[PDB]
């Protein structure tokens, strides 16, 4: 198994990067000694007026409807060209 595991792939580290990206993306900036200082602000903001309306804005996006059709038509053209 060890030889099969070590000789399996070179893309393991690249896959790991993505595992790091999510949790260290979402977490607030200030370190865990002072994380309660961020919790006070983010907890006070949470119940008064809705904060961070896009929870994830660099991963998941909702395209405008006028753009969507022009976007899909381009990749259908590229599919036939492929």
């Amino acid at each position: 198994t060890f030889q099969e595991v070590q000789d399996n792939t070179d893309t393991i580290w690249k896959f790991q990067r993505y595992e790091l990206i999510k949790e260290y993306h979402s977490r607030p900036a200030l370190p865990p000694p002072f994380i309660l200082l961020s919790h006070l602000i983010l907890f006070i903001r949470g119940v008064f007026l809705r904060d961070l309306p896009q929870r994830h804005k660099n991963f998941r996006q909702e395209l405008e409807q006028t753009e969507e059709e022009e976007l899909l038509s381009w990749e259908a053209y590229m599919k036939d060209n492929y």
């Binding site: 022009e70 381009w74 036939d80």
Partner: protein
């Protein structure tokens, strides 16, 4: 609004028949708020070539052309299988994009004009419209286009709005969507079809001589009519284009009137009679054959022999991907067959067809038809085609031009 000084001081219109100065010109915009507007001018069926020329290249700010192509087909009776339609639009995109072409049609939202405009919108989304906008110029009758109430105005209407109706289309027709220019024509009548033909052919000849005095030699830009299938009007516009010597009509090998000429074009001119064409009209126009007058049959059966009289302007092709045959092959063959039998002795048969055969990847036709063994060449003639083949990554034309007489010592001198 600087064009408005000229466009109410040169171009007239027709009424009552007497003529008067025109109105109702501007820029139409369709339903999408941001879909790019066009430019419409009515010109009532009889105008000077100089005034139309000044409208064409000066007051619309429109650059010189490289290849004019014209598409004629059936409207309101046009049926084609999905396979042939798909192959035709895929070929027509590549024809219309590799060269800086102009494409011309009778733009109304009915049939073959719809199938041209949808391929043009598919490419302009596929291109992203960065620069070099494709010009798809349309010519339609003023009288038979409908719901012009929001369009007729005596002072100009630049953000002119227009909506597609698609309901009241019994004796009138709806205007198309995917064009950019519009020349509407008016004969003083409000119901008759088929007025546009004469100014369409005269506009083809007018565009054909635009590239003269611009460069070193007097070579005119090529024109090509591509006919798919259509009824009594399409045969009329084919004949009216072929009266002019330069246009070359290229026919699809699948349709109804295209199958008529595809079956007539085998026999000699003496063989064809009025019984044979009557037999073929019963055979191909299965429905609506009855509605035809015998006198109208007598008119077609003279039109068809006048089309068959000149055999070096008539070419039937058949699209098949197995035998490596497409629309560009047909355009290039029908363009080479015309020039070889002409008044000129030489030096113009090859000059503008070589760069067009290099821009497309059609090496096989090029070698036999242009590099005939009875020809003689010099490297200083073949330098620009060598540069054009070498930049755009076509190694086979490099291999062929290298051994037909391009010296590298002369080329990089």
């Amino acid at each position: 609004c600087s064009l408005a000084s000229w466009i109410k001081e040169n171009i007239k219109k027709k009424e009552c028949v007497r003529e008067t100065p025109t109105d109702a010109f501007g820029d139409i915009s369709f339903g999408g708020l941001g879909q790019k507007t066009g430019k419409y001018v009515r010109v009532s069926s009889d105008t000077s070539c100089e005034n139309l020329y000044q409208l064409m290249t000066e007051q619309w700010k429109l650059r010189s052309p490289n290849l004019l192509i014209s598409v004629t087909g059936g409207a309101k009776n046009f049926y084609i299988k999905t396979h042939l339609k798909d192959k035709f639009r895929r070929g027509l995109i590549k024809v219309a994009q590799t060269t800086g072409a102009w494409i011309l049609t009778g733009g109304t939202h009915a049939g073959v004009m719809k199938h041209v405009g949808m391929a043009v919108r598919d490419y302009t989304l596929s291109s992203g419209s960065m620069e070099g906008q494709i010009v798809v110029i349309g010519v339609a009758p003023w009288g038979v286009i409908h719901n012009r109430s929001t369009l007729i105005h005596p002072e100009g209407r630049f953000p002119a709005y227009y909506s597609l109706d698609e309901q009241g289309q019994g004796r009138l027709s709806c205007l198309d969507i995917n064009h950019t220019h519009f020349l509407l024509v008016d004969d003083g009548t409000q119901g008759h079809y088929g007025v546009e033909i004469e100014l369409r052919a005269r506009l083809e000849k007018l565009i054909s001589k635009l590239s003269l005095g611009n460069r070193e030699s007097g070579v005119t830009i090529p024109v090509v009519c591509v006919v798919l299938d259509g009824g009594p009007g399409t045969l009329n516009t084919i004949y009216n284009s072929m009266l002019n010597h330069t246009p070359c009509v290229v026919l699809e090998g699948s349709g109804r009137l295209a199958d008529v000429i595809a079956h007539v074009a085998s026999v000699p001119v003496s063989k064809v009679t009025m019984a044979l064409i009557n037999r073929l009209l019963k055979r191909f126009f299965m429905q609506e054959y009855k509605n035809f007058t015998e006198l109208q049959i007598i008119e077609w059966t003279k039109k068809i022999q006048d089309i068959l009289r000149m055999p070096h302007l008539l070419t039937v092709f058949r699209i098949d991907e197995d035998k490596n045959y497409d629309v560009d092959v047909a355009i290039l063959q029908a363009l080479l067959k015309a020039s070889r039998s002409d008044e000129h002795a030489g030096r113009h048969c090859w000059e503008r067809q070589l760069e067009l055969a290099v821009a497309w990847n059609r090496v096989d036709i090029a070698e036999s038809e242009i590099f005939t063994e009875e020809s003689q060449w010099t490297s200083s003639d073949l330098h620009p085609a060598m540069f054009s083949a070498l930049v755009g990554d076509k190694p086979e034309f490099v291999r062929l031009l290298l051994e037909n007489g391009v010296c590298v010592r002369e080329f990089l001198e």
